[PDB]
Design an enzyme around this catalytic site. Structure first.
Site, PDB file in Angstrom:
ATOM      1  N   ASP A  35       0.810  -1.217   0.000  1.00  0.00           N
ATOM      2  CA  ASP A  35       0.000   0.000   0.000  1.00  0.00           C
ATOM      3  C   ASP A  35       0.843   1.268   0.000  1.00  0.00           C
ATOM      4  O   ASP A  35       1.290   1.729   1.053  1.00  0.00           O
ATOM      5  CB  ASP A  35      -0.942  -0.004   1.210  1.00  0.00           C
ATOM      6  CG  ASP A  35      -1.986   1.100   1.146  1.00  0.00           C
ATOM      7  OD1 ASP A  35      -2.119   1.747   0.080  1.00  0.00           O
ATOM      8  OD2 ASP A  35      -2.680   1.310   2.164  1.00  0.00           O
ATOM      9  N   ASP A 222      -1.333   5.342  -5.683  1.00  0.00           N
ATOM     10  CA  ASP A 222      -1.796   4.524  -4.557  1.00  0.00           C
ATOM     11  C   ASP A 222      -2.134   3.089  -4.970  1.00  0.00           C
ATOM     12  O   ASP A 222      -3.225   2.811  -5.478  1.00  0.00           O
ATOM     13  CB  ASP A 222      -3.013   5.185  -3.899  1.00  0.00           C
ATOM     14  CG  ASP A 222      -3.478   4.449  -2.653  1.00  0.00           C
ATOM     15  OD1 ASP A 222      -2.823   3.460  -2.272  1.00  0.00           O
ATOM     16  OD2 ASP A 222      -4.495   4.857  -2.053  1.00  0.00           O
TER      17      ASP A 222
HETATM   18  C1  LIG Z   1      -3.539   3.453   8.641  1.00  0.00           C
HETATM   19  O1  LIG Z   1      -4.889   3.585   8.210  1.00  0.00           O
HETATM   20  C2  LIG Z   1      -5.156   3.195   6.919  1.00  0.00           C
HETATM   21  C3  LIG Z   1      -4.266   2.497   6.091  1.00  0.00           C
HETATM   22  C4  LIG Z   1      -4.634   2.151   4.782  1.00  0.00           C
HETATM   23  C5  LIG Z   1      -5.894   2.494   4.268  1.00  0.00           C
HETATM   24  C6  LIG Z   1      -6.334   2.129   2.839  1.00  0.00           C
HETATM   25  C7  LIG Z   1      -7.061   0.718   2.749  1.00  0.00           C
HETATM   26  C8  LIG Z   1      -8.280   0.613   3.716  1.00  0.00           C
HETATM   27  C9  LIG Z   1      -8.971  -0.761   3.603  1.00  0.00           C
HETATM   28  C10 LIG Z   1      -9.474  -0.947   2.166  1.00  0.00           C
HETATM   29  C11 LIG Z   1      -8.288  -0.908   1.191  1.00  0.00           C
HETATM   30  C12 LIG Z   1      -7.282  -2.018   1.540  1.00  0.00           C
HETATM   31  C13 LIG Z   1      -6.775  -1.821   2.975  1.00  0.00           C
HETATM   32  C14 LIG Z   1      -7.965  -1.868   3.942  1.00  0.00           C
HETATM   33  C15 LIG Z   1      -6.083  -0.449   3.099  1.00  0.00           C
HETATM   34  C16 LIG Z   1      -7.591   0.457   1.300  1.00  0.00           C
HETATM   35  N1  LIG Z   1      -5.147   2.105   1.923  1.00  0.00           N
HETATM   36  C17 LIG Z   1      -5.347   2.974   0.976  1.00  0.00           C
HETATM   37  N2  LIG Z   1      -4.377   3.358   0.097  1.00  0.00           N
HETATM   38  N3  LIG Z   1      -6.512   3.669   1.086  1.00  0.00           N
HETATM   39  C18 LIG Z   1      -7.004   4.707   0.191  1.00  0.00           C
HETATM   40  C19 LIG Z   1      -7.190   3.239   2.189  1.00  0.00           C
HETATM   41  O2  LIG Z   1      -8.274   3.649   2.578  1.00  0.00           O
HETATM   42  C20 LIG Z   1      -6.774   3.193   5.112  1.00  0.00           C
HETATM   43  C21 LIG Z   1      -6.422   3.546   6.426  1.00  0.00           C
HETATM   44  C22 LIG Z   1      -7.412   4.296   7.277  1.00  0.00           C
END
Ligand SMILES: COc1ccc([C@]2([C@]34C[C@H]5C[C@H](C[C@H](C5)C3)C4)N=C(N)N(C)C2=O)cc1C
EC number: 3.4.23.46
Length: 367
Positions: A35, A222
């Site tokens: 991520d 992203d």
């Molecule tokens: C530390 O907190 C976070 C960390 C990652 C993410 C997410 C997330 C949130 C869910 C859904 C999806 C996959 C994974 C679980 C990471 C994106 N990763 C991205 N890039 N995005 C836009 C997100 O919403 C969200 C949060 C809140």
């Protein structure tokens, strides 16, 4: 040797790409979403209906408690901070002590059937939770080892939930993973992987917008987002142009809204009806840019769903956009490189492209 990192990524269409990691001593195996859109190493650490495995701190002789909680609501997940030894079996041959947020409770965070149990936030400390003092994984890795401050992603998707594959090359660039030249766009600020889009065309047609709109209120790359996400005004202009180009064939609005799916059967899909989309990114030289050109094969994800959707938090160049290309996160030189991927999907009339230069502003940035 990067050869051992090739194909180290897997996932399910729409549910992200994950790499295998181990945490603790003895090593606990977990699949961890790659991520670039976040900055926390956060891993399930308590039973959850969607988890078949989870990090068990009490099973680790090398776990150290930071005695500090962390609560992250959005749209949530909360956990406890600690450190432990982390490795990536199909990555660099090192082990580093990294911060770990042990997720003990969450709501709509984990995805049913994704096959991953944690998140590897590869962006910068500025956006880490609870704050920028919690050193992100990659920062620890670079500080603790001799691994160069750079990594690259080749996301391949499926091609003909579908299974996807790809590679995360840590500490360098694998030339076998791409063809042609790498073009770099500056990282505007080290928090997200922020970039500037200076122009965008649909089937060669310039959307003719003030370029500030393309980056309103920011543009980021992203891997943890599936779709190409566009600011409201840009989205509407994009769909309009795409609807027109594919006029000879009408679809339900639910499809354009990324809700309903559209189906043909066995290689009857009329790809040629859908236009290509070119994103021009600011170059390393002021009034100089380059474009990445994506095909309908990238933004129609498998029956297909429209993988372009509206954003209220700026443009998001997510997986479907990265899947055409080999993407280099050159943290050392604050730039992101793009080249044509060895694994991108295309037909016999068009192909994903990275092309430059194109002369064009620093005023495309939306403060
Ligand atoms: C530390 O907190 C976070 C960390 C990652 C993410 C997410 C997330 C949130 C869910 C859904 C999806 C996959 C994974 C679980 C990471 C994106 N990763 C991205 N890039 N995005 C836009 C997100 O919403 C969200 C949060 C809140």
């Amino acid at each position: 040797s990067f050869v051992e990192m090739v194909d180290n990524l897997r996932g399910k269409s729409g549910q992200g790409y994950y790499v295998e990691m181990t945490v603790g001593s003895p090593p606990q195996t977990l699949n961890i979403l790659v991520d670039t859109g976040s900055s926390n190493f956060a891993v399930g650490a308590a039973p959850h209906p969607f988890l078949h495995r989870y990090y068990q701190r009490q099973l680790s002789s090398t776990y150290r408690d930071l005695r500090k909680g962390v609560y992250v609501p959005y749209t949530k997940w909360e956990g406890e901070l600690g450190t432990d030894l982390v490795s990536i079996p199909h990555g660099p041959n090192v082990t580093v002590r990294a911060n770990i947020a042990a997720i003990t409770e969450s709501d709509k965070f984990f995805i049913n059937g994704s096959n991953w149990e944690g998140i590897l936030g590869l962006a910068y400390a500025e956006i880490a939770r609870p704050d920028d003092s919690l050193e992100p994984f990659f920062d620890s890795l670079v500080k603790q080892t001799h691994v160069p401050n750079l990594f690259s992603l080749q996301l391949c998707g499926a091609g003909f939930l579908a299974s996807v594959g790809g590679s995360m090359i840590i500490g360098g660039i694998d030339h076998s993973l791409y063809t042609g030249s790498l073009w770099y766009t500056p990282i505007r600020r080290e928090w997200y992987y922020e970039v500037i889009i200076v122009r965008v065309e649909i089937n060669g047609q310039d959307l003719k917008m003030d370029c500030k709109e393309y980056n309103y209120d920011k543009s980021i790359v992203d891997s943890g987002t599936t779709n190409l996400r566009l600011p409201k005004k840009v989205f509407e202009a994009a769909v309009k142009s795409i609807k027109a180009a594919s006029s000879t064939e009408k679809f339900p609005d639910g499809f354009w809204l990324g809700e309903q799916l559209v189906c043909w059967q066995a290689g009857t899909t009329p790809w040629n009806i859908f236009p290509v989309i070119s994103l021009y990114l600011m170059g390393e030289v002021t009034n100089q840019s380059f474009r990445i050109t994506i095909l309908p094969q990238q933004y129609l994800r498998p029956c297909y769903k429209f993988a372009i959707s509206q954003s209220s938090t700026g443009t998001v160049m997510g997986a479907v956009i990265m899947e055409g290309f080999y993407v280099v996160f050159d943290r050392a030189r604050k730039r992101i490189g793009f080249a044509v991927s060895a694994c991108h999907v295309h037909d016999e009339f068009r192909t994903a492209a990275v092309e430059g230069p194109f002369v064009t502003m620093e005023d495309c940035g939306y403060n």
